[PDB]
Amino acid sequence: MNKDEAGGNWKQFKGKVKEQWGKLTDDDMTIIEGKRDQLVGKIQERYGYQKDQAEKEVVDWETRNEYRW
Fold first, then answer.
1. Cβ(23)–Cβ(42) under 8 Å?
2. How many domains are there within the chain?
3. SS3 (DSSP) at 69
4. Selection from 30, 28, 39, 31 nearest residue 65 by Cα
5. What is the rounded CA–CA span in Å between residue 13 and residue 28?
6. How far apart are CA 30 and CA 18, in angstroms?
7. What is the C-alpha to C-alpha distance for residues 65 and 38, in angstroms, rounded to an integer?
8. How far apart are CA 46 and CA 6, in angstroms?
């Protein structure tokens, strides 16, 4: 499946991530959008976590939603 549009449904995950994490801002959000890697980076940027911890939270939140593609 091709990458879905970042319009409308994006407002959902923008909010969703900002509930689960929250440290990330709307600018951080738009860089992520649906990239697993980008969220990993953002977690390591906004909080300053390690890759281990960042992907730990990413995978968890991922499986909760899974609307990544």
1. no
2. 1
3. coil
4. 39
5. 12
6. 12
7. 16
8. 22
Which tokens sit at 41? 């980076």
CA distance 50 to 37: 13
Solved by what technique? NMR
Environment class of residue 33 by beta-carbon count within 10 Å: exposed (0-12), middle (13-18) or buried (19+)? middle
CATH code at 14? 1.10.1470.10
**CA 8 to CA 63: how far, in whole Å?**
21
CB 14 within 8 A of CB 29: yes
Domain with 27 in it: 1-69
Contact between residue 29 and residue 21 where contact means Cβ atoms under 8 Å apart:
no
**What is the phi/psi pair of residue 21, to 5°?**
-95, -75
